[PDB]
């Protein structure tokens, strides 16, 4: 059993009073049915990660399968706390997660048997704040006619894989025909910086170090720091980053139409090697 | 390239003017990047399935990867229609699906290359109506304190797998202690009948042939016919039923607490071999 710490805001040199944690374990008969993830959230703590890991391994964590609109996994924790007291609410009062996010093989978890979680890894993300900022889901799911979606394609080395995320929408000017090198230089003024976290398993963290338009900035809640979790973007790929080393190998900007019909008209514009990856 | 027809309401002997369709294809470079599903929806048609299959194979179907809050796949179709004219809106004006529902390996689909869908199977569900009835997602995601969730666990032979679905909530009477044989006989009066469809890939269809309480019936929109798609319940398991033969082997009722905290108190009640599986 081991841990790994991630510090997405390392270049900001801030003191990190907060720790986001997520752990992974075998779902076992009280043999191994599947692997699952147990997101503990953010606690205000400065404890040593070995103390946190060891107190977590002392807990009895139950795994109960259920359903709503979709299959769900309920975690119940049991045992006295000391170091884990900042995560006291989550660890002591049960928590529920969509099986798709936290378990690939929910279909293999038993109902006639009791199931426990045997933790083998603890993932930490150091934060100087109790909240991380993610663009609201309603706004990211928004589509407009005659619009260009500003998306990023992050390549990850772990074979090699990619995932795509969306920042917002530019206006597709009527009849105006927008050049690649044009856009690229509009994106370059944003001076986007990318670093990895482990929020949800794997998170991509974005700092806006340059200039960005008011109409686009508003789409991102006027926040110079944005966080996107791979658990939201691609739960299947996210599973492969659990207990596995990752780095960003390459980031492209992919400019696309927003609404589906306009995909028949406009092809993707692929701007390679955008922003800058922080040595981390 | 082949097709398969499903008739979930076969024991009702109704004339089926409507066909729900969903097809599967390799996502190819214009080599094979992944498998994807293309849900076409419901059309008012009586065409032969070989005519539908052959006209579908005549189309140029493009596969474009994009993102919103989560990774998405946009389908574009191209070619003149005759038999597929009931699906004219979907086939000719683009459509967008969460990658998690329609593609396991979205991360492998290219952006610097064009991608097409090479269809190898067409799945049909005969319906006597243009709409299928699914309990609203808001209502299925609802949780109450001191409540018993009425859920079903469907076993499928294809190795063997299961999936869980939720009908609604009973009230957990204060201090009253509800017996297994009690509940079982309350469920048996409902005379639930289960049959398979292919809505979303695999659908479980439920007909209420007996008696059911007003407070519970209201939770299911007062509908004697309910449909649950495996694409909503477990997108990962759903993938294994694409182009693969399935039958229901066994159905249990699993009575559970609703809210997560109460999972620490109340264990699951497992009522085996509930309802009846229609020979289909």
Query: Three-state SS string across chain A, please?
Result: CEEEEECCCHHHCCCCCEEEEEEEEEEEECCEEEEEEEEEEEEECCCCHHHHHHHHHCCEEEEEEEECCCEEEEEEEECCCCCCHHHHHHHHCCEEEEHHHHECCHHHCCCCCCEEEEEEEEEEEEECCCCCCCCCHHHHCCCCCCEEEEEEEEEEECCEEEEEEEEEEEECCCCCCCCHHHHHHHHHCCCEEEEEECHHHCEEEEEECCCCCHHHHHHCCCCCEEEEEHHHHCHHHHHCCCCCCCEEEEEEEEEEECCCHHHCCCCCEEECCCCEECCC
How many CA atoms, within 13 angstroms, populate the side-chain half-sphere of residue A250?
Answer: 12
Q: Contacts of residue B76 in chain A, CB cutoff 8 Å?
A: 260, 263-264
Yes or no, beta carbons of B142 and A76 under 8 Å apart:
no
Say yes or no for a CB contact (<8 Å) between A66 and B107. Answer: no
Contact B140 A95 (CB under 8 A): no
- Determine whether A67 is exposed, middle or buried from the number of CB atoms within 10 Å of its CB (0-12, 13-18, 19+): buried
Task: Give Rg (Cα) of chain B.
Answer: 21
Size of interface A-B (CB pairs under 8 A): 150
How many other CB atoms sit within 10 Å of the CB of residue B141?
13
Residues 146-165 in A contacting B (C-alpha not used; CB under 8 Å)? 149, 151, 153, 161-165
Q: Which residues of chain B does A233 touch, with a Cβ-Cβ cutoff of 8 Å?
A: 67, 70-71
The CA radius of gyration of chain A, in Å to the nearest whole number, is 21
Beta-strand relationship, B276-277 and B192-197: parallel
Among chain A residues, the shortest Cα distance to B96 is held by A260
Of A163, A235, A270, the CB nearest to B112: A270
Partner residue facing A234 (CB), from B71, B141, B260:
B71
Q: How far is CA A215 from the centre of its chain?
A: 25
User: Who among A64, A106, A161 is closest to B234 (CB)?
Assistant: A106
CA atoms within 13 A on the CB side of B223: 16
Q: What's the order of all strands across the beta sheet hosting B247-257?
A: B160-171, B147-157, B247-257, B269-271
- SS3 letters across chain B: CEEEEECCCHHHCCCCCEEEEEEEEEEEECCEEEEEEEEEEEEECCCCHHHHHHHHHCCEEEEEEEECCCEEEEEEEECCCCCCHHHHHHHHCCEEEEHHHHECCHHHCCCCCCEEEEEEEEEEEEECCCCCCCCCHHHHCCCCCCEEEEEEEEEEECCEEEEEEEEEEEECCCCCCCCHHHHHHHHHCCCEEEEEECHHHCEEEEEECCCCCHHHHHHCCCCCEEEEEHHHHCHHHHHCCCCCCCEEEEEEEEEEECCCHHHCCCCCEEECCCCEECCC
Resolution (A): 2.5
Substitution target in A236, A239, A241, A246 with the highest count of B β-carbons within 10 Å is: A236
Is A137 part of the contact surface with chain B (CB cutoff 8 Å)? yes
Question: Is B269's Cβ below 8 Å from some Cβ in A?
Answer: no
The nearest alpha carbon in chain A to B162 belongs to A107
Tokens of A155: 């390549």
> A270 and B142: CB-CB below 8 Å?
no
A107 to B163: CB separation less than 8 angstroms, yes or no: yes
Do residues B255 and B269 lie in contact, with contact meaning Cβ atoms separated by under 8 Å? yes
- Rounded CA separation A266/A256 (Å): 7
Q: Rounded CA gap, A124 and A201, in Å?
A: 10
Experimental technique used?
X-ray
Q: Of the candidates B100, B137, B259, which has its C-beta nearest A100's C-beta? A: B100
Of A74, A96, A165, the CB nearest to B67: A165
Q: Which of residues 13-72 of B touch A (CB under 8 A)?
A: 62, 64-71
Using CA atoms, how far apart are residues A106 and A66, in angstroms rounded to an integer? 10
Cβ(A164)–Cβ(B122) below 8 Å: no
Sign of the C-alpha dihedral computed for residues A235, A237, A241 and A242 taken in this order = positive
Residue of A nearest to B112 (CA): A270
Residues from chain A contacting residue B239 (CB–CB below 8 Å): none
Question: CA of B9, closest CA in chain A: separation in Å?
Answer: 23
**Which residue of chain B has the CA closest to A70?**
B233
Nearest Cα residue to A242 out of A126, A109, A101: A101
Q: How many other C-beta atoms are found inside a 10 Å radius of the C-beta of residue B78?
A: 12
Of A229, A269, A5, residue with least CA distance to A133:
A229
For residue A125, count other CB atoms closer than 10 A to its CB.
26
> In residues, how long is chain B?
280
Measured between beta carbons, which residues in chain A are less than 8 angstroms from residue B237?
106-107
Every domain of chain B and the residues it spans: 1-131, 132-280
User: What backbone torsions phi and psi does residue B77 show, to the nearest 5 degrees?
Assistant: -115, 150
Q: Which of A41, A71, A89, A156 best probes binding to B when mutated, by most B CB atoms within 10 angstroms?
A: A71
Using CA atoms, how far apart are residues B239 and B200, in angstroms rounded to an integer? 10
Query: Please, are residues B155 and B250 in contact by the beta-carbon 8 Å criterion?
Result: yes
| Chain B residue with the nearest C-alpha to that of A63 | B263
Let me know if A15 is exposed, middle or buried by CB neighbors in 10 A (0-12, 13-18, 19+): exposed
Q: How many CB atoms lie within 10 A of CB B14?
A: 13
Q: CA-to-CA distance for B118 and B163, rounded, in angstroms?
A: 30
**What do you get for the CA distance between the two ends of chain B, in Å?**
23
Between residues 193 and 212 of chain A, which touch chain B (CB distance below 8 Å)? none
Interface test with B, best of A97, A107, A159, A272 (most B CBs within 10 A): A107
């Amino acid at each position: 059993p081991k841990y790994k710490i991630y510090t997405p805001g390392a270049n900001e040199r801030k003191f990190n009073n907060y720790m986001y944690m997520i752990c992974y374990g075998f779902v076992e008969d009280v043999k191994i049915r599947t692997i699952a993830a147990y997101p503990l959230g953010v606690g205000k703590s400065t404890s040593h990660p070995q103390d946190l890991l060891e107190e977590l391994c002392s807990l009895k964590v139950t795994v109960r399968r259920t359903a709503g609109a979709t299959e769900k996994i309920v975690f119940g924790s049991s045992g006295p706390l000391h170091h884990l007291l900042p995560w006291k609410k989550i660890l002591t009062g049960g928590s529920i997660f969509n099986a798709v996010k936290v378990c690939r093989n929910v279909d293999q978890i038993q109902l006639e048997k009791q199931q426990s979680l045997r933790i083998f890894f603890l993932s930490i993300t150091k934060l100087n704040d109790s909240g991380i900022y993610m663009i609201p889901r309603t706004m990211l799911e928004f589509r407009r006619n005659n619009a260009i979606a500003f998306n990023l394609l992050v390549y990850l080395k772990i074979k090699v894989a990619s995932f795509m995320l969306h920042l917002g929408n530019f206006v597709r000017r009527a009849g105006k025909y927008y050049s690649v090198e044009y856009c690229k230089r509009k994106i370059d003024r944003m001076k986007l910086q990318f670093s990895l976290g482990s929020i949800g398993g794997l998170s991509l963290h974005i700092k806006i170090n340059g200039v960005i338009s008011k109409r686009l900035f508003a789409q991102m809640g006027f926040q110079k720091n944005l966080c996107f979790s791979l658990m939201d973007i691609n739960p299947w790929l996210n599973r492969l980053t659990w207990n596995n080393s990752c780095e960003i190998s390459r980031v492209a900007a992919v400019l696309q139409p927003s609404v589906p019909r306009e995909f028949m008209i406009y092809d993707d514009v692929f701007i390679d090697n955008t922003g800058k990856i922080l040595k981390g």
